[PDB]
Amino acid sequence: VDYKNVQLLSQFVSPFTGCIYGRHITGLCGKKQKEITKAIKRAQIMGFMPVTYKDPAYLKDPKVCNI
Amino acid sequence: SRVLRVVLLGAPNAGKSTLSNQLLGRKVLGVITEKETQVILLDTPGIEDPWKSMESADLVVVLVDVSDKWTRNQLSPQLLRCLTKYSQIPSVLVMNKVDCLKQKSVLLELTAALTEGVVNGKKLKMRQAFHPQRIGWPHFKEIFMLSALSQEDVKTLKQYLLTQAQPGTPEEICANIIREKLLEHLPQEVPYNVQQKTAVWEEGPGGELVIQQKLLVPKESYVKLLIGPKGHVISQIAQEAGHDLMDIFLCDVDIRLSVKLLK
Amino acid sequence: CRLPPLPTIREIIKLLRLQAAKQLSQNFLLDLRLTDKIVRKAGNLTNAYVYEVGPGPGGITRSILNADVAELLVVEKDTRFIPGLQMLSDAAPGKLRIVHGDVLTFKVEKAFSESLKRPWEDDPPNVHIIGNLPFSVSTPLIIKWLENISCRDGPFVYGRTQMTLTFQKEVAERLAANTGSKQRSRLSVMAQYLCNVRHIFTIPGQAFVPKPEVDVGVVHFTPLIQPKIEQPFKLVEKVVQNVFQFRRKYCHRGLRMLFPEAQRLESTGRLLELADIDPTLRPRQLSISHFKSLCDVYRKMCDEDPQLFAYNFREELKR
RNA sequence: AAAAUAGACUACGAAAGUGGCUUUAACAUAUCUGAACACACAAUAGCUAAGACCCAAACUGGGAUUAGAUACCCCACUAUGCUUAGCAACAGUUAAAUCAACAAAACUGCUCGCCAGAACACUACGAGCCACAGCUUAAAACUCAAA
RNA sequence: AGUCGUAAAGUGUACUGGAAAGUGCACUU
Ligand SMILES: [Mg+2]
Ligand SMILES: [Mg+2]
Ligand SMILES: [Mg+2]
Ligand SMILES: [Mg+2]
Ligand SMILES: [Mg+2]
């Protein structure tokens, strides 16, 4: 899980608010949940990922979240 | 076209909001339009706003709670002052919450006290036995005895009002419904100290409205009361809230309530 | 002397038209025995002129009339009790003179004859005040009457009239507090440089028919022949208030606020040095002689500086 | 300035405590018990010096209200809230009748500290501050058959 | 004693001069 892979990290945020999903929604084991969380924050603060919304270019990727 | 401006006056918990909701037919200034008649109901806080509402009033509806033993026997002095300064406006008495009375013949005596024995300019002579701060208001045009909660004879008052007419956000809604359920189910001050935060609001794959709402409270005991035994309390609220939403937006709604402590 | 029986709480609820016991917003002493005690502690009232405030149901009234007073002037605010007091007056003809009005504005100086006026240096002038008022009214009243003693007017046109008033237990303790005590405050000094003040006894809350959550003290005031500070009342009041505004800090922290900021540092020091107040004295450790010294020096400072006495430091902090 | 989501996680730290990102240092110890007196921390009161002052705010003023108004509403502004510098343990057992009760199922072994009526009673002979009249500061006797 | 009368809420602490208790700060269910 890399902070530059914004496509993968956008598969774990809310399309309308940009909030990160929890493990009850994502289904990840807690360690990979922590990796995804830290990567998302790193990307957001380093100017790679939007924070208040999901980047529209990635709205049509496979839905891996149970929401 | 006939129009009537009617203002509701009375004690705080006399049920003015309840009666307004029943007349409107919806739980909501209100406007009732029927055929050629328009009735503008003005709900005022219980006793500046009531007097300002009187400044544009065509009729006054004075509600008195008959179940309240402490206040049923008199009209409050501020209400009497309000009527006196605006005596020119017609006034109608409504005795609310009659369903709560065990011995309902009491109502009769109350009328004599509240109307000072005079209604619509006619004295109420009553068979008399074997042979200063005003307490009532003798200029009431008419008397009604109803129970706003059960809609008992609210239709009669509605028809009366129609007769006296003279020629001339969705998130907020969900929050209000959740607040109503919290008030109904939670005790004492707890429902007043619950902060709501919308966490998710979207359309699911099946066209349903997926709602995740977060209930924030300042104390752990409030969390325990909210969740209830085995999660029953909160669960109940959600379902009922969801059911209400079924009728409001007219779709499928998946509402999930989660409780967190305010840090 | 046969008098009507005391009204029970049932008749009192009926009289006030409340129809229940938890809506009085008032506590009555309906125990004629404690009122006997209070009237006993007021002194020897035989052929005395008693100005009784806050009559209420009339336990104090009955107790006082039981003592052989000459005239008993009653001043009641509520009109629902005037009927009972009129029955009392009829039962004891010539002794009870009832009046309607506020005690905070009623003029006692004209009430009694001018043949009772004794000189200030002589004995108390056979005219007594007894009072069981609401505690929301007895504190402004005692402040007003303390000003009157300072000016030798009002009820004290007859001389050194003695007062017997009921206060809250804490307020009574503070009125009769000694130097260094934990209850020493503004009220202690203000009462004590003009009066001999004695907290006689405390009545527990359980003795009042609607029982309050507080105790009630009875305090006796006798105006002093020689006041311990010979200055205007408002000046002493200002000095005491500024001293006691910071009750737990040194006395100079409160005394610096009497002066404008521009001259705060030097003027405060000049005040303290022309007085002999050690600046490490905390406010509860100041006797009335320390306040006399501060008041004299402050009167001087005002007299050679007109603007000073009107200064309020909060009105300067607003800008 | 302080860190929504993750966090339905329960990790790090001796404790208090730590949850925005990056980077740099960096997270003692191969048996246990053993400190009032040694070294480090930590928290809780209360005062003392200076300093900042947006905001809030005991006290203190001002305005409105019944017929002892609202203690309760509104305005202004203090102390203060801020910033510095100071004043039972450890290892093993669930076998036994477990089992005064109530809590929190009872146990052993081994070590340290502590406990032998009410009584951590009451009391100012006095002492300090004060400077004639007030404040702060105590143990013991004594008594009782209870607590 | 009758020879007497009668039927949201809390805990602390600080200040309190409109104190039959109020307000401020911190806590508990
Ligand atoms: Mg060790
Ligand atoms: Mg402010
Ligand atoms: Mg040990
Ligand atoms: Mg106050
Ligand atoms: Mg308090």
Side-chain angles (χ1 to χ4, degrees), chain B residues 19-168 170 175 187 191 199 204-207 218 228-229 231 238:
Chain B
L19 188 153
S20 302
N21 292 318
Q22 297 306 341
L23 290 168
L24 290 166
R26 186 178 65 247
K27 192 194 172 204
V28 182
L29 184 146
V31 184
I32 301 164
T33 186
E34 182 65 26
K35 304 180 180 172
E36 56 82 21
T37 307
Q38 184 170 85
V39 177
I40 301 159
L41 68 94
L42 305 172
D43 184 43
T44 68
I47 56 166
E48 66 183 1
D49 292 352
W51 301 313
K52 292 178 185 161
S53 302
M54 294 298 102
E55 291 183 350
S56 72
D58 299 318
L59 189 138
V60 185
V61 182
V62 172
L63 282 74
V64 177
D65 187 342
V66 300
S67 78
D68 295 332
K69 293 183 181 186
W70 309 114
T71 63
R72 66 185 194 175
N73 296 338
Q74 68 184 359
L75 297 180
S76 67
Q78 290 80 18
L79 173 61
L80 288 169
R81 288 172 188 195
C82 199
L83 294 168
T84 304
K85 63 181 71 175
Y86 314 128
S87 59
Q88 285 70 241
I89 309 181
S91 60
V92 170
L93 178 62
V94 171
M95 283 159 104
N96 191 22
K97 313 193 197 168
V98 298
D99 56 297
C100 296
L101 284 180
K102 186 265 185 182
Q103 181 60 254
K104 284 172 47 62
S105 60
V106 172
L107 292 163
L108 300 171
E109 280 76 6
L110 293 175
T111 301
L114 282 71
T115 64
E116 303 189 342
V118 181
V119 185
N120 204 8
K122 299 173 184 174
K123 181 173 174 64
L124 198 49
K125 185 176 186 292
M126 294 182 286
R127 194 258 186 279
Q128 297 295 298
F130 281 75
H131 292 284
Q133 188 274 331
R134 284 85 170 93
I135 311 184
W137 175 247
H139 308 286
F140 280 120
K141 297 298 293 294
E142 289 299 328
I143 311 300
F144 291 81
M145 305 148 176
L146 58 79
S147 177
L149 187 61
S150 68
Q151 297 189 7
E152 190 177 2
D153 292 315
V154 174
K155 294 184 206 188
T156 70
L157 178 61
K158 180 177 75 68
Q159 185 59 58
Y160 175 90
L161 274 179
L162 269 73
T163 55
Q164 278 86 36
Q166 301 302 311

Side-chain angles (χ1 to χ4, degrees), chain C residues 15-16 26 28 51-61 72-86 88 96-104 106 132-134:
Chain C
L15 179 73
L16 282 71
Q26 209 157 30
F28 312 95
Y51 168 48
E52 190 277 331
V53 291
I60 299 292
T61 307
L72 198 158
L73 201 158
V74 163
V75 174
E76 177 70 31
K77 214 199 177 204
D78 206 285
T79 180
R80 275 84 58 74
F81 292 113
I82 301 297
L85 302 173
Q86 286 300 341
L88 263 182
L96 198 75
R97 207 214 305 164
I98 302 152
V99 177
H100 191 82
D102 196 314
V103 291
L104 292 162
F106 179 78
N132 186 358
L133 281 159

